[model samples]
Target: TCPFYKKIPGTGFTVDAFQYGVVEGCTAYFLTHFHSDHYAGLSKHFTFPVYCSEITGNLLKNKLHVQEQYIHPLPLDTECIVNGVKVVLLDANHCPGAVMILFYLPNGTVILHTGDFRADPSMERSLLADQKVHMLYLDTTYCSPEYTFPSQQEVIRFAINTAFEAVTLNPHALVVCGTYSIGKEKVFLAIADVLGSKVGMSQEKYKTLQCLNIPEINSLITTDMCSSLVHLLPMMQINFKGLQSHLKKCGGKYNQILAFRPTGWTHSNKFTRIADVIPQTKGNISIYGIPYSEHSSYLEMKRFVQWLKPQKIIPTVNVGTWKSRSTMEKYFREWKLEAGY
Candidate 1:
């Protein structure tokens, strides 16, 4: 059972499961993305066939440990039938396996559901204008000017520059960072591309990359298969004592060692402490701070809404409650809606 009909604070026409059943006239549910907010309930509740992109299906299988039979994988730009409804998958540029869903009814009503997309002009040009669209369910996660973000290219450049700076300062020092296996694969590629050499990969990261099947990126490693370049070191290998001992033994032997992570250092003080941990080599030990985020910023969200001209918009996953609520309100106003709820 779903929530009863009530005016959601900003979006109009809140309805219960009964109302949804009557309107859609089906016992089916469709998920637009593999992200938790979109598919969180599916694991707990048994419903009609659940659908998503092929990549998303693989991710769900590997990450969530879900059964393959329960998921219906639809490739991008291909239409699939679910409970007699026509659904098409569109490439979403926000995350590695993300996708937007387009629904086509026999009655000629077309509804598009953008799960979570960055304001990627390339993606917008590819998906939004390709066909005639009617109703649109949008991902207005950061729908305000105050939440503007840097472009992906810019962020990538920053990461590269920061890594270069760190390498220049810390000759013979090993740097480890965190990132997702498949999603942030580009960061690893960027490093590999610049170094013109394959970094070593731990068994775990090698397996993870194998699952992604991106041979071009994964193949650029030494035959010996070291995990330091991909930053695939085991947790047991990354403690302060072990790293210091390694640096002490290999003093002035190499220029630098680079590792990547999706997270670990959050504050400047933490980064300073990390830098201080390294023993004195001939060179300085530096940690790189790069900005590489997957989501679109506030300005991008507004621009996307303007471009799509959707009849209705909705926001699903976000971090803060007050920020999201206020941003949605601002978005409603920008869209010229007197009232959204």
Candidate 2:
């Protein structure tokens, strides 16, 4: 996006670090997190060097054989420079090692990329300290007011209670918690500490979890299936198709498995193609979707915009154009109006 700066086709630019570099390649590249959408085409085959958190870069270094010399670690809150471009990284509060990139250009231009995050108190403090933003590349994943929800910690607390509440009613059933391979350790850890039960995960997941060295998480993971009534499963397993298959595979070892999906998309009516969650029993299974999101809600988004007041705002997720101001204006018309920003 920083075209005026030279030497490399794009230097100290780009978040997500997906896709190949420009024709002339980049002087520096940034990786936000390890989500599939964020890390699309990265590989050993990648031509450009990447700057990301050590935790996010661990898997790529181990699995891809990506040369150590080419990859760089961008520690949170630390300022690093690359060919006149000064940048700082901040904890995004979305997932482990996720970051908000703050760009300080040579000619007094300040740009911010809020890589998927929950705009909580800590995040607000960080932005308030350095509030001058000329242009902001916003992660408007849940920009609409319909997506308005509670802070991530509160949501996780609700989820933990919901899981236990379901357990109390159905004493015979195992509470199956849906989680990603990464990104949801806090959910599992909270559930385990409260219930004093070990959560079972596949070995593949455990290997990646080990590298994080998260104390609370590392102390509570296990491979012995059904050793704990609360089971940790891949998020997709919350669906009836996946749930049915998993229950059948166990040969009735557990009856009436309750599924809880921890994600922001709790408004099932808003989404299609998947059975998200219900308040309680839809059938034999009592499924619930916890509004546990990492991104800012619409209110939080509006407050953040008002706080920074950038010259122009670019919607990262839904913007149809990158170069046209008219397109951006039309795109954010409803977006800004709805939030009263």
Candidate 3:
């Protein structure tokens, strides 16, 4: 469940809370990215001024059809004052346009809101060196120890190599990748680039990617089914039956099917190493549950928490229930203790 903690304390700003419709005392609204969960209440009828990155702003106009005048695209890594509060946007490293917002209140409070990020090594160099953060609104989607998985580059490498091998065994094999509206573009896009193959995606998704304005992705997308063997479809259509119908739609251009269903939840604590993670095959269909996640793992979260050393942490996701929140809080305490704070 998405949290309703829209209003940031000590400020008149509300973030990712368009569904609430002009929340009381919220003079400005901020959006981290264009993900559905983050942008549920936003629509064409939006009235309040919204602050976000240029890519997300473009998506708001193109996809949600929200009025362009209401959207404000802020430059990243630069400090800007919005309604008397100092604000800064930092790259979240999760999706194409995602960002972590830094708010410096008038009374000397430093709050960092990480709106869905994959904690990266480059974050340390992005002007977070010596500043003391009082509060950190974290993306605690995978806060537990069991969710530890390989890095994104490692998983992408594994996916490319695995699919390449399957196609080598059966030259006519079709590679199908499951993705959300905006996330997981890197996985399938990398596969298409490395194999030198064309990509097939819905025109709607193609339009959304076009809004992202990444030039290289433009040349890879195609609407014709027969033109590209690698088809990127929604996560709901990643099953065996889904592959069967999709292949038939392509006029039976291929015989065998190799598919990738990627998510962070696919990681198993039973595995000794990441390389041991393998695919499940049944007859002509081969399905691989790749742990290619956009969120940071348990270990990655711990490191981020310790390095940032925030005095307080409020989890943004998986924060509905007391039990879940407490479980994550315990980890926060442990990390704080380890950091000698």
Candidate 4:
């Protein structure tokens, strides 16, 4: 699923294995997060000791149903020795348990692999100033000018306000917040906490949320809809076609479904200026693709790259896509940027 893993010159240790279900003779396996795409072929018979955040390890053994013996828990923002190299994990800020892995090699060179992360403000505080990154494996998921949306904080704030306004306008409508299988627990949880309302979730979602053991989260969601004032659903249910089909298919249980989706594809230059929430309403369904994205915006990527001053920028996704490399090349020229924040 990923071609980012590399074997250290001497130790023979490798990062996230993708060559086979398990890379043979790899020193150790480090999983960035629990995204299915990243852990494509891992199984019970996975080779070697695996290392990841405590939450990710727990999910592998419990949620994904992989064997626990090979999985080891690694702490975030803390240095740990692996094959005698200095390795540290920092919060990736993409999803729960996601990490930015830094390797301090013996010859004073460093390799930084940002598994999947945003331009997290915390990176400044978490990373030491003297640690110079030799090579950077960047997470350029949406590294084009097309991704000009605001930060996750701003997007979710817009989402919450939009949901509130919708509920006010449509008193009888059920509010549905669209999220991923593992991400955006913040969106639903925030809305629920602010409103102090009973929020609805599927049995499966509830299990993962409950596993988080966050006391506040436990109070926010319920399996029963009648006990809730708002609904939290998978992204599919909130789309125009999906919402209509579900409402019609379910015997028209509700008069309206006010919904929104928080994602990076909230792309468009049509707006005259940046606003809190840019909405698109279709009949009874009002969906906003809020930029509550976990990935970095183009500007954020530029800033980080400029700061790191790495020798090379190896993109994580769209690895072989021709235009992406060209776009990134263009940005590298833009790196000789004006001194404007």
Best by lDDT: 3
Pairs that collide in candidate 2 are none
Q: Give the higher-lDDT candidate: 2 or 4.
A: 4
Q: Comparing 1 and 3 by lDDT, which wins?
A: 3
Ordered list by TM-score, greatest first: 3, 4, 2, 1
Q: After superposition, how far is residue 160 of candidate 1 from its true place, in Å?
A: 2.7
In order, candidate lDDTs are 0.54, 0.69, 0.84, 0.71
Off by over 4 Å in 4: 1-11, 213-215, 245-253, 269-282, 336-341
Task: Say which prediction, candidate 1 or candidate 4, comes out ahead on lDDT.
Answer: 4
Which predicted model would earn the best TM-score?
3
TM-score of 4: 0.87
Shift of residue 253 alpha carbon in model 3, Å? 1.2
TM-score of each: 0.69, 0.82, 0.95, 0.87
Model 3 per-residue lDDT at 229 = 75
Alpha-carbon lDDT of model 1:
0.54
Worst 10 residues of 3 by lDDT: 265-274
Answer with 2 or 3, whichever has the higher TM-score.
3
On lDDT, the stronger of 3 and 4 is 3
User: Where does candidate 4 clash, by residue pair?
Assistant: none
- Residues 169-288, candidate 4: write the lDDT tens digits: 766666778766687777777766656587887888777766554666656789987666577778777778887776564344577776767666643633533374556778877776
